[PDB]
Design a protein around this ligand. Sequence first.
Ligand SMILES: O=c1cnn([C@@H]2O[C@H](COP(=O)(O)O)[C@@H](O)[C@H]2O)c(=O)[nH]1
Ligand SMILES: O=c1cnn([C@@H]2O[C@H](COP(=O)(O)O)[C@@H](O)[C@H]2O)c(=O)[nH]1
Lengths: 217, 218
Amino acid sequence: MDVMNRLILAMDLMNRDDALRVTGEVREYIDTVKIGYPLVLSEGMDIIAEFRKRFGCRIIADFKVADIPETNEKICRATFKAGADAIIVHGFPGADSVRACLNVAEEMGREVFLLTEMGHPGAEMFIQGAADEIARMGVDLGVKNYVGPSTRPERLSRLREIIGQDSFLISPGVGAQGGDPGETLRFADAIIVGRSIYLADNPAAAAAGIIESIKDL
Amino acid sequence: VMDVMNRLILAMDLMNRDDALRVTGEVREYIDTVKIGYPLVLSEGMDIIAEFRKRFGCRIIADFKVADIPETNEKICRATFKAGADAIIVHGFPGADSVRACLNVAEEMGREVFLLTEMGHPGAEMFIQGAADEIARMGVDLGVKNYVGPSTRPERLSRLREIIGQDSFLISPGVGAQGGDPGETLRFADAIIVGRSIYLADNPAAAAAGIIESIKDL
Ligand SMILES: O=c1cnn([C@@H]2O[C@H](COP(=O)(O)O)[C@@H](O)[C@H]2O)c(=O)[nH]1
Ligand SMILES: O=c1cnn([C@@H]2O[C@H](COP(=O)(O)O)[C@@H](O)[C@H]2O)c(=O)[nH]1
């Protein structure tokens, strides 16, 4: 996957007008947008097609898929039907639940991104201790796309070690949550940035600044 | 705790508005509580909740298995309650702060959180099962009063009931298609969740009636 400027916009605004306007302001800096439930549940799944029509950008649905296999397949089908190019799935629920997603992605020409470890404080309670095993499960299942935490560069580095240099890795937690753009890119192929951009007084300048700090990479 | 008619909750996972509405209407005389998940919501929009409320006199539980960071969890809960959902199901594996974020929104918006402590599919054995008891204990500590546990694992469901106490409310999916027995599950759960066994039946009403007939004494 070729992500422009190695920067993925996490568009979590919950108003269609603001979401479209802000994304439009930073469109020259990106070509990949991560859309999640905050926006989809507020404005509908048709918003995905609207983004493709207005920006011709890649769409990653950050839906943290975490249900039983049967339901996961239905969720992936509905998501890809709406035009998403990829979907983010939790690994904690087990291999069968991940496989269900991989099946639908293969049938509709999309990609599955396996979320192995999250970066918020609570992730240390249960997720962190299972993260390495979840990553190995991904490798065993043939997963090639992963999501790891910018807030814990040592954990992100370990994830990269497990999956190898060939796998694709994206990482949220940059900016608002404290992650550093440059350091995160030492291990991840692309960084995900939300609030530091869409809540900034001037989103375009915010995006430009981040890219400027990593222009060397 | 919510008074679930016949201790039976319909898992409406059909992905077509016409079929979802028709089947729910066919069993309305037996159920006043419907669980709506992403299969239907992502196919027809959150306004589907409005349609169900308008057409039927049923409570709505949004099975969204919320599993994001605290900030995103808050946004998801706000959007879900804004649409009319009475309650939302949240995953506990992401930790205490992520669950607390949901409880805070539920409290401010006057709605409820159901904590999913353990799942019943085969894959649940890998990581979820070993963390379930602690996730349940965490829920009790956080003040959670509503829980979701697996009908497919009677031993696990029984332990969950012990951990949360008799006052807590517990609902359980996995009955029917996944092999769980209605009566056996109700020994521990306040209500059972049933999807395919009802919505894929030639006559959903007859299927619902049959299940209720098997637990009449309960
Ligand atoms: O471990 C994870 C997984 N996902 N996200 C998601 O990535 C984005 C981060 O946005 P932010 O830059 O505004 O913090 C949000 O959409 C959030 O749900 C995280 O923050 N951390
Ligand atoms: O541990 C869990 C948690 N949730 N569900 C959900 O409960 C319903 C079960 O439906 P079924 O009767 O068709 O199996 C579906 O909506 C499914 O996502 C399970 O099956 N198991």
